[PDB]
RNA sequence: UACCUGGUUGAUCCUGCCAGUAGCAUAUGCUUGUCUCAAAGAUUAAGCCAUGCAUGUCUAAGUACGCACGGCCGGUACAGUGAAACUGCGAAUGGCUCAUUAAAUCAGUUAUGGUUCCUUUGGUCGCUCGUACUUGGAUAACUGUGGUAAUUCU
RNA sequence: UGGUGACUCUAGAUAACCUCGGGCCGAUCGCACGCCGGCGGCGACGACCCAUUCGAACGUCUGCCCUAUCAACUUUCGAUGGUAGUCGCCGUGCCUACCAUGGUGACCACGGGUGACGGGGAAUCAGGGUUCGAUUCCGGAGAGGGAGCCUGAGAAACGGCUACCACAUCCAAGGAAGGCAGCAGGCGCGCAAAUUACCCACUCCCGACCCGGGGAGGUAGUGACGAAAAAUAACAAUACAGGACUCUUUCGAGGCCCUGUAAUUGGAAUGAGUCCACUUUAAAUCCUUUAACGAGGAUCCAUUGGAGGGCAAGUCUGGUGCCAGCAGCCGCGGUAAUUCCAGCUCCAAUAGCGUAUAUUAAAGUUGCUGCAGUUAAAAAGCUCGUAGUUGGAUCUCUCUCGGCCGAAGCGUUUACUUUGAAAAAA
């Protein structure tokens, strides 16, 4: 193909969007933005498929062009805007705020947060570099650049950005005993305490994470996102607290819920 | 024997200035209830004028029992005209579709591609 | 590219030997005793039972503490008990291999409306179902192959609009009454 | 369902194939009431194609002295809507087909510390010690005169 | 300064340079606004550069069908490598100059064939496997065949241009114009494949854009490719027939359960169809819903192949007479033909069924599982012999610590097995 592609097929779209195989040939190709194509959630998917606020893409367009949706405190009118991990979606007309946080099944949840929690977010620092008269710069997972970071912040750490100002307020080091989410791979959406890190020079480091329920798993270092200091998260967790139940336990819980409900 | 209206999955859409619901119609011995009759029944049920109520997609189940469709109740007629699809407005007599066809517009557009300037307005 | 789906499968398999006399006798016995339309209905029930046996055989080869064997065997046994084919006390994978084709044919809506007494026979049952005289719970069911579940077994009525159920006597009765 | 059956001899036991048997794909024949899905000029000719259509695009926010309409005042610079045109962007996506192609393509894996990257997003954008209360020339649209049998020619 | 496993990285310092075809450091635009004039909100747009957002490009490792009646290929004019450069967005024989004589191959190089785009995947399949994959998803390629370019971030673009080759349109002969392997449609080719329809309502894409456009796509049309569900009748009363878990008596009495040409009788049921109104939908259609009409020879009629065997079901009748024909195979037919042509009857599947061909199982008749080789097809005339394949026994608590109490391996490598990461969807 010559030049960039501009379409995304319905069946070739990311699976975690949970799209049909009969409601059209195309899936909304997310715009270029702070998050990768396969790791984002387009605004049209969130407003139409998730929140049911629209029944068509035209209604999503109307909602977005009335300037009602803020992403990280800034109004976005792009219906294919790539919203991703740790982002904040504010709808002041209905007075709600959501955070984009993975379920244990690896899918972005509809996780409502308080209006005072929507004033900040967490960003994993992807790199730190000194430029142009020795000014340190930091690049996070939102592709946002922060000048003059704390000289203690290193790669793989987490920083709490104030959305109003864009400045760093606090940070969590990447160390054992710290809480972390998994943002990719088979264990995507799981939360647990870092127990170990195997360094593999010239290759991918492997980080071992222990669940709150004693379960253990491993991921690549790029798939780890430090959520809180110690075992206390700095953000509100979804319904499941990052505990991946086996299929049997999920079936048992569903049967208990059926018994209690009908 | 009376047609009965029920509202199943109700939501207040302040973003689109309306209310959305799934309408269940019980007509045990009658044909599929006309969209008008449902509009007045919902207007009675939600205490509103019937002309802010747009109902669509009514599928009658097998066996002749209930019919399930969707409904919107707009805050005002102006908001309905701003937010509704043009065809659902034309169903209420609030919009007139273009009187031409696709072929005529396409061949006209390709005819004006040959003329340049103000003469582009003389082709039709 | 289209927004269509091309997922389809055959629900039966034709037998390898077309003229096995014993097999012809058994299939005709089943057809006559359950009021079936053709041999393909027998082969359809034979195929679903065969696939259930295949799943049970695959699971029985596994370790008794395999999470997959536990989960899928429990699901299969639950689905068999729910449709009334397997007894709730026979909840082991080895009792699946003891199931017969007549156990599934007994759960058809036609068989059930014959057994429940709503029909004088099994062919009367089929023509009563196809003529929209039978409802399951509140829903009118037109399909004689409707596999009746255990919870749905006790709600099989004559429909509220049938001459045999509610009112409105049929076309023939109305014509006769009009003619005198 | 981990299956065979007829055929060499006067008869027998074999090797062995032929033929039966069931599915699946194209074609074809005869027949066809209801209903839900649904492939479909690939195979031969990546052969040739009449005609129509398939790629265009304006916001409060680049350029409006077209009365083409047009006013809550008209010495108002520009009310407003706004064709045309200049400008910007897209036209490199999509759609079709399978000719080429045998470590080529392609799949999994890995690398760019060997490169480029419109756009989006974030940062940078008085960091330079040397007519500005805004500089110049055109050219479309428009008016007017034309050439060619003929073109989205000019 | 900071970073990597690793920089000739990043940042810093110095001396200079800084492209006529010359690098950024804003002479742009809207809305809300108030002083002697000053200040200023929120935007739109634009420009260097840094950030891998979308990519693209070029590399690593492993894997691809048949063929030896293809055994040596490359090295001239780059073939393998080295040095310097040129070109390129960059690494590079990418291309030059000089130098060295290298590089690949029986572990199948090189050549030839492919009715070969690759993969996800499909059919079939006990366990193995065999065959297929033009075809909606991903990747590649092409736009009649070659070649060369412009613009641009991105094209060697063809619904762009330039030329040549082939074909071909209009012409007043001067000239002009072309590219359906896009959607329909036509011709041709063939065994072989549909409408010159409606629409941007859905899905998404593009643009300056909430507004325009989209043969992408959706909708309908043709459609027995193929897949799912599923009518063509049900019931009752008399007459037979059957049995009874009735008297019993194998004479018989017998509406207990049954069966039939009754082509007997009777009413009940219903949808195929016609049609109305909704509903559907962008507008419709189709389903679904409602009403009216709609069944007795319910003429509102089920067919396709068979009846010797394989293989289910007539050595019944008529005709023909080794003819005509049937027959996948064995075979039938030369005056009772169980086989042809028919009538009747029967059976197999059934809204389907027969025929041709490709292919899978059957085929343990390609055998890895798993075949054979005295005589059925088959062990080289016989030894040696490199590669290949296969190979006898044997070996049983150490780096900075605030939990023998965080750690290192600097030591002996793999195959195997188990595990954990990572691995598009369909």
Say if CB B19 and CB B13 are below 8 A apart: yes
Which of A25-51 are b and which e, b meaning 16 or more Cβ less than 10 Å from the residue's Cβ?
eebbbbeebbbeeebbbbbbbbbbbbb
Q: Which CATH number fits domain A121-171: 1.10.3720.10, 1.10.357.10, 2.40.50.740, 1.10.240.10?
A: 2.40.50.740
State the DSSP code for B120: G
In B, which residues are within 8 Å of C135 by CB distance? Answer: 63
- Cβ-nearest to A52 among B11, B83, B85: B11
Are the CB atoms for C122 and C141 separated by under 8 Å? Answer: no
Exposure string over C153-171, b if 16+ CB within 10 A, otherwise e: eeebbbbbbbbeeeeeeee
* CA-to-C1' span, A77 to E153 (A): 25
Region of B63 on the Ramachandran plot (φ > 0 left; ψ -120 to 50 alpha; else beta): left
Cα(B39)–Cα(B36) distance, integer angstroms: 5
Structure-token pair, residue B6: 């029920």
What is the number of domains present in chain C?
1
Distance, CA of C149 to chain centre: 10
Are C139 and B64 an interchain contact pair (Cβ–Cβ within 8 Å)? no
At B66 the three-state DSSP class reads: strand
Question: Which CATH architecture fits A174-244?
Answer: Roll (2.30)
* C-alpha to C-alpha distance for A127 and A107, rounded to whole angstroms: 26
Question: Does residue C12 lie within any of the structural domains?
Answer: no
Q: Does residue C95 form part of some domain?
A: yes
Residue C57 lies in a domain: yes
Residues in C touching A25 (Cβ below 8 Å) = 1-3
**Residue with CA nearest to E236's C1' atom:** C120
Looking at the domain assignment, is residue C96 inside a domain? yes
Classify residue A29 as left (phi > 0), alpha (psi -120 to 50) or beta. Answer: beta
Which method was it determined by?
cryo-EM
Q: Which of C86, C133, C138, C91 is nearest to C107 (CA)?
A: C86
Residue corresponding to tokens 């054992």: A176
Whether A182 and A209 have beta carbons less than 8 Å apart is answered as yes
CA gap A66, A75 in Å, rounded:
10
Q: What is the resolution of this structure in A?
A: 2.7
| Spatial contact of A179 and A226, defined as CB atoms under 8 Å apart | yes
DSSP code of residue A213: T
Q: Looking at domain A1-116, does it have CATH number 1.20.120.1200?
A: no
The count of domains in chain B is 1
DSSP code at position A39: G
| Alpha carbon of residue A192 to chain centroid | 16
Structural domain including B107 reads 1-124
In CATH, what number is assigned to the domain containing residue B16? Answer: 3.30.70.3370
| Nearest partner of C5 among A25, B76, B77, A169, judged by Cα | A25
Distance from the Cα of A164 to chain B's closest Cα (Å) equals 24
Determine contact, residues C105/C34, Cβ cutoff 8 Å: yes
Q: Which residues pair with A97 in a beta bridge?
A: A90, A113
Nucleotides of D under 7 A from a protein CB: 1, 3, 21-24, 37-39, 52-54, 56, 66, 83-85, 91-96, 110-111, 118-124, 127, 141-143, 151-153
Neighbours of chain A (3+ CB pairs under 8 A): B, C
CA(A11)–C1'(E359) in Å?
32
List phi, psi (to 5°) of C175: -60, -45
Alpha-carbon gap, residue B23 to A186, rounded angstroms? 41
Structural domain boundaries, residue C61: 18-180
Gaps in chain C (C–N > 2.5 Å) come after which residues?
none
Sheet order of strands, A96-99 included: A74-75, A69-71, A88-91, A96-99, A111-113
Alpha-carbon gap, residue C145 to B6, rounded angstroms: 33
Residue C26, helix vs strand vs coil: helix
């Amino acid at each position: 193909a010559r030049g960039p592609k501009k379409h995304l097929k319905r069946v070739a779209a990311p699976k975690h969007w949970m799209l049909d195989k009969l409601t059209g040939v195309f899936a909304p190709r997310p715009s270029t933005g702070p998050h990768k194509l396969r790791e984002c959630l387009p605004l049209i998917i969130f407003l139409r498929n998730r929140l049911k606020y629209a029944l068509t893409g035209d209604e999503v367009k109307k909602i977005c062009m009335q300037r009602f949706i803020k992403i990280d405190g800034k109004v976005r009118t792009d219906i294919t805007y790539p919203a991703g991990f740790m982002d904040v979606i504010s709808i002041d007309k209905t007075g709600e705020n959501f955070r984009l946080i993975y379920d244990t099944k690896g899918r972005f949840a509809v996780h409502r947060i308080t209006p005072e929690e929507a004033k900040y977010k967490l960003c994993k620092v992807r790199k730190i570099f000194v430029g142009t008269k020795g000014i340190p710069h930091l690049v996070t997972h939102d592709a946002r650049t922060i000048r003059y970071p704390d000289p203690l912040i290193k790669v793989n750490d987490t920083i709490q950005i104030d959305l109003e100002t864009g400045k760093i307020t606090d940070f969590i080091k990447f160390d054992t005993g710290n809480l972390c989410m998994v943002t990719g791979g088979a264990n995507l959406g799981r939360i647990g305490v870092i127990t170990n890190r195997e360094r593999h020079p010239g290759s991918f480091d492997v980080v071992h994470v222990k669940d709150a329920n004693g379960n253990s798993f491993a991921t690549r270092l790029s798939n780890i996102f430090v959520i809180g200091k110690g075992n206390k998260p700095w953000i509100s967790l979804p319904r499941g607290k990052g505990i991946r139940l086996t299929i049997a336990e999920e079936r048992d819980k569903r049967l208990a819920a059926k018994q209690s409900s009908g | 024997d009376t047609v009965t209206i029920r509202t199943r999955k109700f939501m207040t859409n302040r973003l689109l200035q309306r209310k959305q619901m799934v309408i269940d119609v019980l007509h045990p011995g009658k044909a599929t209830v006309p969209k008008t009759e449902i509009r007045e029944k919902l207007a009675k049920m939600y205490k509103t004028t019937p002309d802010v109520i747009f109902v669509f997609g009514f599928r009658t189940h097998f066996g002749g029992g209930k019919t399930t469709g969707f409904g919107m109740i707009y805050d005002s007629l102006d908001y309905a005209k701003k937010n509704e699809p043009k065809h659902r407005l034309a169903r209420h007599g609030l919009y007139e579709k273009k009187k031409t066809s696709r072929k005529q517009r396409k061949e006209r557009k390709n005819r004006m591609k040959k003329v340049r300037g103000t003469a582009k307005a003389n082709v039709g | 590219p289209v927004a269509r789906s091309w997922v389809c499968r055959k629900t039966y398999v034709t037998p390898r030997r077309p003229f096995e006399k014993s097999r012809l006798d058994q299939e005709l016995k089943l057809i006559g005793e359950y009021g079936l339309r053709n041999k393909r209905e027998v082969w359809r029930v034979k195929f679903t039972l065969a696939k259930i046996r295949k799943a049970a055989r695959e699971l029985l080869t596994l370790d008794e503490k395999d999470p997959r064997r536990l989960f899928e065997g429990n699901a299969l046994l639950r689905r068999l008990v729910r449709i009334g084919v397997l007894d709730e006390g026979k909840m082991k994978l080895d009792y699946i291999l003891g199931l017969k084709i007549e156990d599934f044919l007994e759960r058809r809506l036609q068989t059930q409306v014959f057994k429940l007494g709503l029909a004088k026979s099994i062919h009367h049952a089929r023509v009563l179902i196809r003529q929209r005289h039978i409802r399951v719970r509140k829903q009118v069911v037109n399909i004689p192959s409707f596999i009746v579940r255990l919870d749905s077994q006790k709600h099989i009525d004559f429909s509220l609009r049938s001459p045999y159920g509610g009112g409105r006597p049929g076309r023939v009765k109305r014509k006769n009454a009009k003619k005198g």
